[PDB]
UniProtKB/Swiss-Prot annotation:
Its EC number is 3.2.1.17. Monomer. Keywords: Allergen, Antimicrobial, Bacteriolytic enzyme, Disulfide bond, Glycosidase, Hydrolase, Secreted, Signal. The keyword Hydrolase applies. This is Lysozyme C. Residues 1-129 form the C-type lysozyme domain.
Amino acid sequence: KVFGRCELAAAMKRHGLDNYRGYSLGNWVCAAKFESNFNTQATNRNTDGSTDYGILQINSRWWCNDGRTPGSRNLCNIPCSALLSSDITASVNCAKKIVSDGNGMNAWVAWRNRCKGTDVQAWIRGCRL
Ligand SMILES: [Cl-]
Ligand SMILES: [Cl-]
Ligand SMILES: [Cl-]
Ligand SMILES: [Cl-]
Ligand code: NA
């Protein structure tokens, strides 16, 4: 599924990301836009042989099992395909774990480069939240 911006905002809010580890919802919507273009089905292979999956481009080196990233971890205890579902529950739960890990939302390159330090409230403008 390709979410609309506010549609994704609402989904992320219902699933508990708004202000999760102090990151207001706009940060998460912004990260998703630039991580996946709001596309739950997005995948992108990394140089190290891991892949990123889903709306929040969660990586198979540490977070999910995709069966083809040797000596990786699966800290979210999920198959990476779970992160591609139209339903973003698994992605959000895994996102919570990642952001909790020490590095905050710096774990998402798109968030560091395109959302950190920007007016992220803009991403939830207009939304009925
Ligand atoms: Cl698995
Ligand atoms: Cl959802
Ligand atoms: Cl933080
Ligand atoms: Cl915000
Ligand atoms: Na893995």
